[PDB]
Amino acid sequence: AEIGGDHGYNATNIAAGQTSGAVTQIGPAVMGMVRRAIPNLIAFDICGVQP
Amino acid sequence: AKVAPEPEGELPYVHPLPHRSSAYIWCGWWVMDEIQKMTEEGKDWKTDDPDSKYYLHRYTLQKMMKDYPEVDVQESRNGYIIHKTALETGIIYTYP
Amino acid sequence: MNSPTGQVFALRAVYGKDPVAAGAKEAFHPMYGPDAMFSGQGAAKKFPALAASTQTTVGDIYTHFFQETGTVYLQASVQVTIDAGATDAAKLDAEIKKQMEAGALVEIAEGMATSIAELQEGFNGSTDNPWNEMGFRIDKQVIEAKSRQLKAAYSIELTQDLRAVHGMDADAELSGILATEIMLEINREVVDWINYSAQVGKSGMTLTPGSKAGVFDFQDPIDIRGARWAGESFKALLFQIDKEAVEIARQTGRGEGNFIIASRNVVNVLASVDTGISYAAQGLATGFSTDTTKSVFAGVLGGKYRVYIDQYAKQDYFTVGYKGPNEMDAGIYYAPYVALTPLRGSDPKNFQPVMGFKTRYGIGINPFAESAAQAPASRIQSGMPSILNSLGKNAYFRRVYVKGI
Amino acid sequence: AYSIELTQDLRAVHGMDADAELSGILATEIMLEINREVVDWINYSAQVGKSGMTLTPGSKAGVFDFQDPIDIRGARWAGESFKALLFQIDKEAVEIARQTGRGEGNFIIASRNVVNVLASVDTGISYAAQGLATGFSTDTTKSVFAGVLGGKYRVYIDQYAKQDYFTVGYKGPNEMDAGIYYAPYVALTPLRGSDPKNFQPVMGFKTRYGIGINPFAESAAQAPASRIQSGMPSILNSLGKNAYFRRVYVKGI
Amino acid sequence: GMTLTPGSKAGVFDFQDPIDIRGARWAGESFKALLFQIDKEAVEIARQTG
Amino acid sequence: MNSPTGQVFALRAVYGKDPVAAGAKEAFHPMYGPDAMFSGQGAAKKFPALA
Amino acid sequence: GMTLTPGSKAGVFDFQDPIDIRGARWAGESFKALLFQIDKEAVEIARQTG
Numbered sequence: 001a002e003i004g005g006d007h008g009y010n011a012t013n014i015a016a017g018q019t020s021g022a023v024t025q026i027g028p029a030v031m032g033m034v035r036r037a038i039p040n041l042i043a044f045d046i047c048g049v050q051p
Numbered sequence: 052a053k054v055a056p057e058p059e060g061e062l063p064y065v066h067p068l069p070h071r072s073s074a075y076i077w078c079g080w081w082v083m084d085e086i087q088k089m090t091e092e093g094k095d096w097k098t099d100d101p102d103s104k105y106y107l108h109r110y111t112l113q114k115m116m117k118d119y120p121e122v123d124v125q126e127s128r129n130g131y132i133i134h135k136t137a138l139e140t141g142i143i144y145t146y147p
Numbered sequence: 148m149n150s151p152t153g154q155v156f157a158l159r160a161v162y163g164k165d166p167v168a169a170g171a172k173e174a175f176h177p178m179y180g181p182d183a184m185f186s187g188q189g190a191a192k193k194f195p196a197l198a199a200s201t202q203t204t205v206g207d208i209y210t211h212f213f214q215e216t217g218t219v220y221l222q223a224s225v226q227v228t229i230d231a232g233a234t235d236a237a238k239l240d241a242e243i244k245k246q247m248e249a250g251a252l253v254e255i256a257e258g259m260a261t262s263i264a265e266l267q268e269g270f271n272g273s274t275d276n277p278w279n280e281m282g283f284r285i286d287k288q289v290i291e292a293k294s295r296q297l298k299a300a301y302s303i304e305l306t307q308d309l310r311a312v313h314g315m316d317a318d319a320e321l322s323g324i325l326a327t328e329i330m331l332e333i334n335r336e337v338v339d340w341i342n343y344s345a346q347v348g349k350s351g352m353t354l355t356p357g358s359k360a361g362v363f364d365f366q367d368p369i370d371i372r373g374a375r376w377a378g379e380s381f382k383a384l385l386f387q388i389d390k391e392a393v394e395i396a397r398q399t400g401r402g403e404g405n406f407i408i409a410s411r412n413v414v415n416v417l418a419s420v421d422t423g424i425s426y427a428a429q430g431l432a433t434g435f436s437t438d439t440t441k442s443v444f445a446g447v448l449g450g451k452y453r454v455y456i457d458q459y460a461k462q463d464y465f466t467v468g469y470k471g472p473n474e475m476d477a478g479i480y481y482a483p484y485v486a487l488t489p490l491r492g493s494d495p496k497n498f499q500p501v502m503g504f505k506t507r508y509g510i511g512i513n514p515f516a517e518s519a520a521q522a523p524a525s526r527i528q529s530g531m532p533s534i535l536n537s538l539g540k541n542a543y544f545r546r547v548y549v550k551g552i
Numbered sequence: 553a554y555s556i557e558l559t560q561d562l563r564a565v566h567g568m569d570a571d572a573e574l575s576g577i578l579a580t581e582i583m584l585e586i587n588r589e590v591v592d593w594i595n596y597s598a599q600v601g602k603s604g605m606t607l608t609p610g611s612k613a614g615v616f617d618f619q620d621p622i623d624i625r626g627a628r629w630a631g632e633s634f635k636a637l638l639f640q641i642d643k644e645a646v647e648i649a650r651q652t653g654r655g656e657g658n659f660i661i662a663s664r665n666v667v668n669v670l671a672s673v674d675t676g677i678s679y680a681a682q683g684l685a686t687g688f689s690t691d692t693t694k695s696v697f698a699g700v701l702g703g704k705y706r707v708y709i710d711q712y713a714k715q716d717y718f719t720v721g722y723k724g725p726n727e728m729d730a731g732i733y734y735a736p737y738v739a740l741t742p743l744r745g746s747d748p749k750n751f752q753p754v755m756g757f758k759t760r761y762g763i764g765i766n767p768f769a770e771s772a773a774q775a776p777a778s779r780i781q782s783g784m785p786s787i788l789n790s791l792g793k794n795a796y797f798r799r800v801y802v803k804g805i
Numbered sequence: 806g807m808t809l810t811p812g813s814k815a816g817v818f819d820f821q822d823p824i825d826i827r828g829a830r831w832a833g834e835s836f837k838a839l840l841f842q843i844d845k846e847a848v849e850i851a852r853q854t855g
Numbered sequence: 856m857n858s859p860t861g862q863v864f865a866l867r868a869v870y871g872k873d874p875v876a877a878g879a880k881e882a883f884h885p886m887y888g889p890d891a892m893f894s895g896q897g898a899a900k901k902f903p904a905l906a
Numbered sequence: 907g908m909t910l911t912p913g914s915k916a917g918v919f920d921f922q923d924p925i926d927i928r929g930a931r932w933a934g935e936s937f938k939a940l941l942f943q944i945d946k947e948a949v950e951i952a953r954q955t956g
Contacts, residue, residue, distance in 0.1 A: 011529045014289045033156035040696045048730030064357040066619045070612045077368035081823040127375045130628035132621045160577045180712030183588040244715045256589035295894045331889045372630040376834035377827040379629040382682045389685040396691030403691040411848045424683040432844045438851035449684040459888035831935040832928045855885025
């Protein structure tokens with residue numbers, strides 16, 4: 001009566017691939033990476049630059 | 052010479068205007084029509100009839116006029132800002 | 148999700164010489180503007196913080212951290228107190244903004260003196276003058292594929308007479324309703340997750356000083372901007388929805404509100420008013436599919452907001468959300484793994500047919516959902532929605548109840 | 553000051569550079585801080601608006617709240633009130649020309665709320681209208697510059713607004729006629745190093761700009777003091793004294 | 806129920822009640838407020854019958 | 856009607872293992888939305904009714 | 907009868923009564939109220955004469 005089981009829903013358990021069943025999964029796949037966008041600029045038409 | 056009974060809370064907001072010791076509230080056309088009708092049969096609008104359909108707004112107007120001596124109340128039929136002295140009589144512009 | 152239990156990374160650009168630490172403020176925060184004198188005068192010296200009963204002497208600079216729009220550095224233009232009775236963060240921010248409005252506590256930003264800057268971290272025999280450093284954190288979130296299943300278990304004594312007397316099948320009906328119910332339940336689950344995670348709208352920068360802070364009622368003179376009759380009143384809803392779309396843009400940092408999901412009443416109000424910039428108008432609802440029988444998606448708001456209708460609305464509301472062109476910047480992910488794997492069988496004990504459906508989807512939460520926390524917990528965070536990270540915290544969704552319709 | 557093992561393993565596992573990421577978030581941070589600094593200098597050195605010649609007699613100085621009938625010229629509902637806001641902007645733009653003598657108001661920088669208000673009004677001369685914010689980029693993700701008002705005012709956005717305001721400014725064709733100068737001297741000079749004890753590399757960025765104030769910005773004095781004045785903004789000479797920028801807090805949006 | 810204005814009579818639509826006519830005035834704005842009400846229940850049927 | 860006393864059938868779609876029962880909720884219903892968690896956690900555990 | 911606004915004179919139509927002119931303002935709203943009154947009374951002839 002082999003059971004597939006599942007990770008204990010803990011983030012550490014899924015990250016390590018731990019599974020209460022017989023088979024321990026390789027890893028938690030990949031779904032990309034989210035980086036926070038750089039906030040925008042206001043240009044310099046408001047104030048003269050004059051290098 | 053009497054004070055208006057308090058109809059619980061939930062009073063409409065009055066915006067304080069320390070620029071001229073005034074304030075501002077948007078009443079509409081029904082409140083002004085009701086006040087004009089009340090001040091035509093010899094009745095009073097500041098405190099009389101504490102169970103009116105829109106007495107809560109009239110009580111708010113009375114409190115606003117007591118707290119601020121130069122209130123600026125805006126109706127909705129014409130959007131005119133009647134002052135405290137103009138609102139004292141209860142007759143706004145026209146009509147019987 | 149081709150493979151079960153996917154994961155999503157998230158890079159935090161935080162400063163303070165420690166990529167991971169306690170209370171390290173993120174740099175490129177859409178909510179929190181960067182401390183302008185962090186590389187500047189904030190690196191040469193540490194300014195005294197601004198709090199209750201901090202008598203602001205003339206000419207110096209005080210650091211503060213607002214709950215919204217980040218941290219500020221205020222130059223005291225005149226001596227004044229900060230209303231020592233204000234101890235909570237909200238009241239402290241209110242008092243500081245009051246001082247700002249009066250002009251007593253102005254907001255400035257400057258660089259660093261060249262003498263202090265040219266010698267930093269032990270130069271020319273000096274000491275105790277470190278640089279201001281930065282770094283990236285990179286913490287991950289992990290989701291899990293939850294499952295869902297149903298059974299039919301229809302008798303074989305039934306099908307005979309039911310087909311003989313009604314012409315049905317008793318199998319294409321039960322299987323159809325099972326699959327339809329599973330799909331409907333999954334859809335209702337994701338819709339409730341959108342409403343569950345939606346932030347309380349009309350609270351903060353979208354508030355009018357006199358409004359009710361959470362509901363938009365047409366009977367309030369402040370809420371309708373002193374509107375009259377219906378052409379003027381219903382356009383205040385459009386103005387508020389635009390304000391909350393721009394607030395979503397500020398909080399998320401990805402873009403304006405892309406869609407709204409509303410009740411029948413709010414959608415009907417939207418359709419019955421001229422949404423364009425043209426006087427005040429009203430009439431029968433034409434542009435939007437007000438009913439929820441043909442389809443749910445009911446038109447668009449000037450070609451900007453996709454207006455869906457939530458057919459099971461408790462009291463009333465509209466929820467403005469966000470969904471960028473990419474499938475990643477959504478705010479909540481419904482990632483199916485297996486869809487409706489049908490199973491059949493018949494126990495030899497009774498030979499009565501039995502069938503069932505199984506599916507496994509799992510729901511994930513976009514990192515940077517909170518937009519108010521500069522760092523996650525444990526650096527390996529559960530991606531599934533929960534009390535801690537999803538309830539009333541998704542910056543993407545803002546939900547407002549509309550009253551007085 | 554990033555580690556070397558961090559670069560070695562992060563390039564292998566994530567595919568980044570571990571140097572262009574840090575250098576990127578350092579140069580971007582410097583530019584963002586400089587931009588916020590010049591914007592804050594503009595706001596802080598801006599004359600308090602709606603005072604003197606632009607003040608309606610029965611109104612507060614420096615505040616334009618939509619709930620004051622005299623403030624909005626006795627407006628009603630929404631279109632009239634926001635059009636009164638537009639009229640106030642025009643009045644301040646002409647006061648800008650009166651004070652500076654260099655030209656009418658040329659740009660405004662406002663909060664998200666004020667820009668959103670401007671985007672939902674028939675800015676031309678025709679009745680009174682409201683609707684969906686159409687003509688302006690109300691949100692600051694794609695860009696901060698949010699359209700133009702009447703083809704005249706380059707309406708920018710102050711995304712990190714504290715409570716609410718709008719500042720009508722000016723900028724002539726010359727970079728000299730500005731009202732305030734962000735005059736860079738060096739621009740993001742990089743610096744590399746490595747402590748020989750541990751060999752872990754350190755990288756940094758150094759800039760030197762300085763901010764100058766335009767003479768005649770006060771424009772209320774026919775002669776300055778000492779014939780040699782400090783050009784950096786300060787409390788004495790750049791606290792609500794520039795005639796090039798006029799700032800008003802808009803309340804009750 | 807769903808289509809009721811909170812300050813209304815719950816069963817009638819009289820043009821003399823400003824809450825009922827969305828605070829309208831004269832004739833072009835008061836009658837049009839009925840066109841809203843006739844809409845507010847036309848959708849309501851779609852909620853019930855389906 | 857050609858013949859008197861006509862009739863019309865109606866097919867409800869109710870869940871709960873019992874097509875007929877005391878208060879068996881109907882699945883497909885315009886007013887009444889489908890229950891949120893019946894095929895999901897509703898089978899793994901039973902939640903307490905709120906009163 | 908059926909053409910009587912509950913707040914009118916029942917026999918005359920004066921432009922000065924707000925209920926008679928349905929709350930009209932100035933005269934562009936008021937003469938149109940008179941138009942509505944004559945329209946409403948033209949209908950009742952179809953009710954009575956048939």
